[PDB]
Amino acid sequence: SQKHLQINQTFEELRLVTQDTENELKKLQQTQEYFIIQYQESLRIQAQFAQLLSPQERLSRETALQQKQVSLEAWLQREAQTLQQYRVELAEKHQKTLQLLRKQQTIILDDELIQWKRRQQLAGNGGPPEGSLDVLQSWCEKLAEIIWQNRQQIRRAEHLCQQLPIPGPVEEMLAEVNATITDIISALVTSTFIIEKQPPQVLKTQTKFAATVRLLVGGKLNVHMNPPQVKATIISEQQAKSLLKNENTRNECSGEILNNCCVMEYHQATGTLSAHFRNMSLKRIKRASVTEEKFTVLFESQFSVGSNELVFQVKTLSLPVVVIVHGSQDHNATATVLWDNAFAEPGRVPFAVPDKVLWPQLCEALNMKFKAEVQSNRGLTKENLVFLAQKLFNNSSSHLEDYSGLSVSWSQFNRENLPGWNYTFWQWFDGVMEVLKKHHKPHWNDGAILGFVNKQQAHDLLINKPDGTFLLRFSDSEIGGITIAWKFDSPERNLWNLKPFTTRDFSIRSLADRLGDLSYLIYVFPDRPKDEVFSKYYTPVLAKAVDGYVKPQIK
Numbered sequence: 001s002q003k004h005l006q007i008n009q010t011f012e013e014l015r016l017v018t019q020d021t022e023n024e025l026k027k028l029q030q031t032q033e034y035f036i037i038q039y040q041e042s043l044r045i046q047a048q049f050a051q052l053l054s055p056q057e058r059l060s061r062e063t064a065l066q067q068k069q070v071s072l073e074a075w076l077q078r079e080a081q082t083l084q085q086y087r088v089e090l091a092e093k094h095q096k097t098l099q100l101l102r103k104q105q106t107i108i109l110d111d112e113l114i115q116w117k118r119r120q121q122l123a124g125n126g127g128p129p130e131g132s133l134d135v136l137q138s139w140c141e142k143l144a145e146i147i148w149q150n151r152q153q154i155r156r157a158e159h160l161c162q163q164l165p166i167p168g169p170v171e172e173m174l175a176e177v178n179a180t181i182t183d184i185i186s187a188l189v190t191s192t193f194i195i196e197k198q199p200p201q202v203l204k205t206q207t208k209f210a211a212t213v214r215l216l217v218g219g220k221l222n223v224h225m226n227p228p229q230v231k232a233t234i235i236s237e238q239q240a241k242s243l244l245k246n247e248n249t250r251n252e253c254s255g256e257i258l259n260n261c262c263v264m265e266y267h268q269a270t271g272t273l274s275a276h277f278r279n280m281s282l283k284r285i286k287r288a289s290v291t292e293e294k295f296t297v298l299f300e301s302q303f304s305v306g307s308n309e310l311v312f313q314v315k316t317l318s319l320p321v322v323v324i325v326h327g328s329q330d331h332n333a334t335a336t337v338l339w340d341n342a343f344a345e346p347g348r349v350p351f352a353v354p355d356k357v358l359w360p361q362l363c364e365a366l367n368m369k370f371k372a373e374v375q376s377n378r379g380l381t382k383e384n385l386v387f388l389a390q391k392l393f394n395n396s397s398s399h400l401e402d403y404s405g406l407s408v409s410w411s412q413f414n415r416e417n418l419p420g421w422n423y424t425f426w427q428w429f430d431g432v433m434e435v436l437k438k439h440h441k442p443h444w445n446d447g448a449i450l451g452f453v454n455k456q457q458a459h460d461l462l463i464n465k466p467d468g469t470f471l472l473r474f475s476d477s478e479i480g481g482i483t484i485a486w487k488f489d490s491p492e493r494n495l496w497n498l499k500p501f502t503t504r505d506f507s508i509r510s511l512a513d514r515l516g517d518l519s520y521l522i523y524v525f526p527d528r529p530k531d532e533v534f535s536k537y538y539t540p541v542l543a544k545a546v547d548g549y550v551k552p553q554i555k
């Protein structure tokens with residue numbers, strides 16, 4: 001809460017200086033109002049002379065009014081300069097608080113909001129949750145409360161100058177203040193239309209999906225009065241670039257969305273103005289690989305603040321989505337999305353990503369997604385990272401630090417196949433998460449699957465162990481396969497690599513049941529016995545009702 005306390009201090013100073021300008025604005029209006037009354041007195045003074053007639057009294061009444069006329073005329077002249085001075089002083093104070101406001105806004109919007117948004121982007125790859133927008137709304141409320149007060153303050157100060165003009169520096173001073181105000185409100189309004197909950201980045205046609213679009217300055221401006229409509233629209237990466245550059249053909253889009261319209265709702269209790277699209281669906285998609293084609297859901301809205309004097313057109317784009325029609329296309333779709341959420345640079349043109357990235361950056365991305373997919377805190381160890389670097393780079397080294405300067409290209413990750421294989425690194429890696437996720441989630445968590453060791457590594461671990469000591473390994477030759485490697489002293493071969501099982505095999509008999517059937521397996525690596533690790537998962541054979549068993553019995 002270091003920068004958090006400085007943000008709060010600046011907000012508190014901003015409200016104190018805005019009350020000062022308000023006090024001085026009412027004071028200026030009083031000064032001007034009295035000056036207008038004193039000016040009428042100087043008019044009555046001449047009308048008093050006009051009511052002339054005997055110079056025995058008319059010589060004394062003429063001198064009384066002359067002395068009075070002069071003093072009031074002198075007071076008026078001095079008060080006019082005071083009116084101009086206090087006016088300049090107010091504009092200077094408004095210019096000062098607006099410059100401070102600009103700095104305070106840049107902090108909330110270009111830093112804290114971007115950090116929240118990035119936190120949300122990385123959460124797509126199974127990263128840590130971004131958290132509630134409560135803090136960001138609390139600040140955007142104050143930003144709006146303050147810019148709106150100063151705006152109405154200057155509109156009032158301007159009204160005074162209309163009713164009593166005094167030419168000088170004040171005109172261009174107010175022209176500057178106004179330009180600053182439109183810049184700040186436009187920025188505050190356009191930037192605070194954000195997507196609280198993103199749509200699915202791997203989207204299947206004809207599948208119900210949801211999104212949430214919040215407006216952080218909803219409660220503090222006159223926006224909830226007429227809650228605006230938001231129109232969800234699916235567009236392509238090219239269409240997204242031209243939408244930003246403004247070189248578009250108005251309604252250019254790439255498909256229909258069912259229930260693509262929603263009206264923002266204000267929740268008094270929380271102060272939130274937000275469109276909840278709960279029943280969206282992709283009816284059709286226009287496509288000019290399918291897997292590498294990035295789309296985005298564009299949310300538009302049009303609304304005003306206070307009166308039709310201030311109207312805005314807001315547009316927010318979702319994180320890139322990949323559309324799949326089969327479901328079987330998910331394998332490679334996840335890879336392009338995984339790359340996007342991880343390696344996207346801030347302030348990029350629509351869905352631009354780096355061609356190559358350094359190996360430890362890709363390590364973060366794989367570890368993050370891996371833990372999320374298997375639903376465990378046991379991630380990829382330093383040894384596991386080396387195993388994958390050996391596989392990926394086709395390098396011998398067993399030192400993670402060696403790979404640190406190397407670069408994985410997109411084609412090296414999920415386009416060109418591995419050395420002697422018919423699959424890519426992503427296909428191999430995703431294959432492992434997929435077999436681990438469907439089944440073996442508790443097994444992976446309980447450490448029973450060592451997995452990321454090559455055929456040689458497993459032998460150079462099991463040799464010095466008793467007959468029947470095994471380890472569970474990931475097959476190289478078969479995507480999503482698990483191989484049992486075990487040492488058992490015998491003629492011309494001591495280490496044994498059993499045939500790899502895939503999800504089809506597990507669907508017939510579980511990993512635990514299959515291990516329990518094989519008597520030649522007795523000790524899971526390193527010491528712990530087989531039944532000690534898999535007794536939990538052996539199937540208690542249940543009697544069938546068809547065989548005449550009225551109550552559930554365990555044979």
Ligand SMILES: CN(C)C(=O)CCN(C(=O)[C@@H]1CCCN1C(=O)[C@@H](NC(=O)c1cc2cc(C(F)(F)P(=O)(O)O)ccc2s1)C(C)(C)C)c1ccc(Br)cc1
Binds near residue numbers: 476483496
């Ligand atoms: C109760 N019961 C019937 C059973 O399930 C147990 C019986 N069983 C077997 O013993 C089968 C029966 C046929 C030959 N067999 C073998 O295991 C023979 N082994 C292999 O044939 C192979 C070993 C590797 C290693 C790899 C590798 F190293 F992991 P990779 O890194 O290159 O991918 C890649 C392919 C292969 S093929 C063996 C020489 C050990 C006898 C079994 C049956 C079916 C399935 Br599927 C799985 C195992």
